[model samples]
Target: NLISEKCDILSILRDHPENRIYRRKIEELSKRFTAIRKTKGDRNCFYRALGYSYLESLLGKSREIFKFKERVLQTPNDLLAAGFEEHKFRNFFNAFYSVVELVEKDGSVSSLLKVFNDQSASDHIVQFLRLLTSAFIRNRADFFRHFIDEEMDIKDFCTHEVEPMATECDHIQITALSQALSIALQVEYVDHHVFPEAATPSVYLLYKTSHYNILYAADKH
Candidate 1:
């Protein structure tokens, strides 16, 4: 499965020793987060986790859903500006668009979960997100280029790292996607540091050992 059922946060600490810092971090994490939905360990986990978390966050949020829909509707033009041919990416864009529309059409968590677990549908969403991330980086190549740790140019970095399926994402990809979609994300690490700390994050994901998973607050479930 590309994703797993929500499990109690404490279940994750079982593999570590009681006194270990890793276990302690999870224990502290349990105070704020109650449950977690794990994505597969595949390299696509980050995008999948982000995709699922963002979609799920839209449930019951009418205003935000409308705003997100408007942003997504403009993505075709965004992709075109990034030099992607409409014919090449139309299906992927439609796959992502329909899922967001589903949310506005009274979609439920169960329905969302089912779609993500289906490999075909889930990969399509991830691919589109990858495209968005790629375009975001490419459109602002000069700005993003300064942050690239590798010796490669921005365009090459996007080609090698941003567009490939099964390629693990780094902080740059996360930032690009969040800004690209105008969505705020809070990634909680084991050490308790939240990236891009905000008063109210639109989506929350747990980051551990380079993988990502959905996180739910105490009353969110």
Candidate 2:
């Protein structure tokens, strides 16, 4: 499966290429290799890497199958086009989602996350992305000690939104929430990824890093 291949790309960027020069060199070489090119074409290679690692580690966890579709041969048996059939990534979520944008005029990075239980769009999707490891997730030990402060804004949003509805909900309402909450609760903490829904294209990249750990770095090997 391509999963193993993705692992290799992560490993290369993780262990050996610590210097910008090597990264730039690989960025050049990326012109030849599509995977490494992802590292280069991406203005923020680190975020791109994060997207990749996230998907892989996720694949390793829950049996959440990646989405895919196939294109059939349009031509006749005479062979203008013999056959084309396949299935590939459609969409899935773990705890977070990353998006990498490229425009001839400007380039940038964005992320998406689901608001968990608030179904009424009470949770307005938020987008914030960066170029380093922390961009992947709220990295703490790597820097200061404020802890949830990084996530504070998000928590505040939830407090304002979810907390109000928290207390007075009815039994059937709570029952309706039972399954969704149950599934989410049963899901492994490591696998509890989410993403923003309104991030421009509603798509995310292929890398993800948690706690500054390059989880899929071994793939390139």
Candidate 3:
């Protein structure tokens, strides 16, 4: 469903990559992929853990160091144990939560734009991850804190917390901005600028990055 929607949006957007709004949305979704990379930042982190062999029993003893590490780490626990190996725990969560993430589309399974080769695409994805992680760190921000269920819904957002945070400057409505985002394939919010909403009537939340020079907006009852 999302892929198709992206294609639809992309069709309109391809002509104008400078579309800011489109770029932000892309960066937001792309965060998940980048997160997996950060969570497993250095391949050597895994290798270093393997060498220690301190938690060898938890990870499993080695006939060959490399094979033992990989196999034991991947294996699941039939019996809950006294202690845990970091790698083993990590693997279990990775396998388990991935399914959860897939199920909970809004929370974890965010998407990014299709500029795969572009360095900007990856960076935007990473930024999105941080925004999510920040929400999780605060219990109120996590939509389903009380339930603590594997599944979460986007609607759960309003129920749990106030809102995901952003700079005061976030509200900018520029159709041209959306076009720009599509072109650069750079949707990370950091990379672009917001337009004062009062100055330009727009659908996006009106935020003031600059002096917020927009005159007092007239309200219609």
Candidate 4:
């Protein structure tokens, strides 16, 4: 399964008994995160984990739903300003918007799981997020350019790294998407690394080496 059912956090340590450093880290993680919902190791894992975790965090939060929906609705202008053709991205946008609508109307874990597990729908959401991240980076090329490899210009970086399916995301991509959507996100690695650094993040994803998985706080369901 590209996305798996939640499992106890300690399950991660079961196979690494001899690695004290890794065990200690998982132990520290278990103290705060009760469970882990894994996504496949496919390169899209970060986007999939982030997309699922973000929407799940907004479930039943009326004000957040309104605020996030408005932000999403306004993204086309950002994409347009970034020089993306509307025809190239509108379907991806609608695919993502419909899932947000599903969350607003039903807000059931089962329905949410269904959409994410359905390969077609899930990839559409991932692709839309890629575009969003790309748009943000391109729109703010002056700021993001420093983060890119010196050999590649901003357009090449976005075309090869941001827009391509299955290209793994890094801190730059995460930062751009989080700021573009006006949502604070935390990646819990050895420590909590919050995007934007100062905001209280609602969505948390557990980072292990190259992959990301959804993390549920001890008090959260």
Best by TM-score: 1
Q: What lDDT does model 3 reach?
A: 0.26
lDDT of 3 by residue, 65-177 (tens): 34433433332331113123444335433533332232233222132212211234333332222222223323232423443345654334322321222222121112222
TM-score of each: 0.92, 0.21, 0.16, 0.91
Off by over 4 Å in 2: 1-37, 63-127, 131-221
- TM-score of model 2 (CA atoms): 0.21
Which of the numbered candidates is closest to the native, going by highest lDDT?
1
lDDT of 1 by residue, 1-221 (tens): 88899898988876435425688788888888889888999899989998888889989989989999999999998899999999988999999998998898957988888888999999999999999999999999888988866677899888899998999999889889989987778888865224776678878888878889888877454
What's the ranking of the predictions by TM-score, best on top? 1, 4, 2, 3
Cα lDDT for residue 105, model 3?
Answer: 35
Where does model 3 exceed 4 Å of error?
A: 1-114, 140-221
- Give candidate 1 misplaced runs (Cα > 4 Å): 15-21, 149-151, 191-194, 219-221
The TM-score measured for candidate 3 stands at: 0.16
Error of 2 at 154 (Å): 19
- The per-model lDDT (C-alpha) reads 0.87, 0.24, 0.26, 0.86
lDDT score, candidate 2, position 33: 31
Model 1 local distance difference test score: 0.87
